[PDB]
Amino acid sequence: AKKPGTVFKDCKDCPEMVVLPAGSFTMGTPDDEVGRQPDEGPLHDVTFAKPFAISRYQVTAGELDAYLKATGVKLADGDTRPGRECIAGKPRYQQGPRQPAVCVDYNDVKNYAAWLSKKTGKRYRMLSEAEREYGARAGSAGPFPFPFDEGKEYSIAKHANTYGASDGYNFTSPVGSFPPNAFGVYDMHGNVYEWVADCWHDHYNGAPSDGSAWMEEKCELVQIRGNDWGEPPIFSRSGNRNNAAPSDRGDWIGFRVAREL
Ligand SMILES: [Ca+2]
């Protein structure tokens, strides 16, 4: 079996995967954490019985393009909002092949993971919300697994891409433009939000404790995680939560994939 921290790819066009360790962690946010929102409790411990892999980066534009070429799929255009349009998977801002894939809805992510699974003979899927927070924290209990930038009160521009140019980028940055966390994972605290599988809940009362996704038979809203290029760093904290309708897409939502070992 592959040791935690091992980085591998199942094919040339496939996302770079990193093995996360089995173990437990505390999910959610302490009451007094700066910026904490009300849906980030209760704090509750979640257990991953087995190691599993996630993409160390958000899936890239070039990686998505490889899928589009292989399958012939055309992604639907997105929501009205002048200057922020998604057209067949492409945002309006300049987007090179190592910037994150965006302008995909929830089902598009599932389709990409199904294609990857068939091509590789491995089991690819969406991350669960718990897996995503686990991977973001990499053992850390506070809002960030890295220190604040020296010289300002609450700046993370040395570690993440958030609103404005102080981090080098107005829009998204190539994946891996900042240091990784202790699990070998990049961009968990900025760049783009990410789809995860879970249906939306306004709290963690009754949340699953085994690393699974918290599903409902019918869901108008699903969870998204992380924080995007246009948002302030107060929402980059590891425990920040948000949601979208699964048919939504935007130039600010991308995704990771996970792989069973
Ligand atoms: Ca920025």
Side-chain angles (χ1 to χ4, degrees):
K2 314 173 178 304
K3 48 198 295 291
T6 299
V7 178
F8 65 94
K9 291 168 60 180
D10 290 323
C11 84
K12 293 180 177 68
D13 277 325
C14 291
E16 295 174 14
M17 304 302 292
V18 61
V19 178
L20 305 191
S24 297
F25 83 115
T26 302
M27 188 179 184
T29 302
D31 294 346
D32 293 334
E33 177 171 299
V34 169
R36 173 197 194 269
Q37 312 286 313
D39 63 352
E40 296 169 31
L43 289 160
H44 64 290
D45 287 10
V46 177
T47 297
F48 303 94
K50 298 192 174 185
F52 62 103
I54 68 167
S55 58
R56 66 173 181 168
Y57 307 120
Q58 288 128 4
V59 172
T60 67
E63 284 157 4
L64 185 68
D65 278 344
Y67 155 78
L68 297 174
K69 174 184 190 58
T71 62
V73 159
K74 193 176 171 180
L75 298 171
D77 294 350
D79 179 41
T80 178
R81 186 188 182 200
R84 307 271 46 103
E85 293 88 4
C86 285
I87 294 78
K90 293 299 288 194
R92 294 308 86 207
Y93 56 72
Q94 293 173 220
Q95 183 200 41
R98 304 245 87 220
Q99 273 163 84
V102 293
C103 291
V104 286
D105 76 2
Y106 179 98
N107 194 70
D108 287 328
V109 174
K110 295 177 65 72
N111 290 341
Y112 174 78
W115 173 77
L116 273 192
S117 295
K118 181 182 185 59
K119 176 174 189 54
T120 64
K122 312 297 183 175
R123 306 191 305 263
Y124 282 88
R125 57 168 170 82
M126 297 184 85
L127 277 67
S128 72
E129 190 179 8
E131 287 168 346
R132 207 288 183 180
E133 188 170 315
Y134 181 62
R137 290 184 174 286
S140 65
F144 304 104
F146 45 77
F148 287 116
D149 297 349
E150 287 295 314
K152 292 174 184 296
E153 187 176 3
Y154 195 118
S155 178
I156 62 176
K158 292 299 183 175
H159 293 275
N161 182 17
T162 70
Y163 172 74
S166 67
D167 53 43
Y169 310 87
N170 301 134
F171 306 96
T172 56
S173 44
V175 300
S177 294
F178 306 89
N181 68 18
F183 278 180
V185 184
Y186 294 83
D187 295 308
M188 279 284 191
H189 306 268
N191 220 7
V192 292
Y193 269 92
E194 295 165 19
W195 294 108
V196 300
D198 304 47
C199 295
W200 171 71
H201 305 81
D202 197 30
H203 59 261
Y204 290 126
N205 300 309
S209 300
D210 59 2
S212 67
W214 195 358
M215 305 308 295
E216 301 289 344
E217 211 162 85
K218 308 176 174 189
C219 314
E220 202 257 282
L221 298 171
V222 295
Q223 303 286 353
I224 57 177
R225 276 298 192 112
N227 196 27
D228 69 86
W229 58 266
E231 293 284 303
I234 197 67
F235 303 128
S236 286
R237 302 170 302 102
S238 291
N240 197 265
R241 307 179 78 196
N242 206 343
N243 66 256
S247 61
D248 288 343
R249 66 187 70 232
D251 68 15
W252 55 280
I253 313 171
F255 65 104
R256 295 179 197 264
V257 293
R259 144 111 136 73
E260 266 131 57
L261 293 171

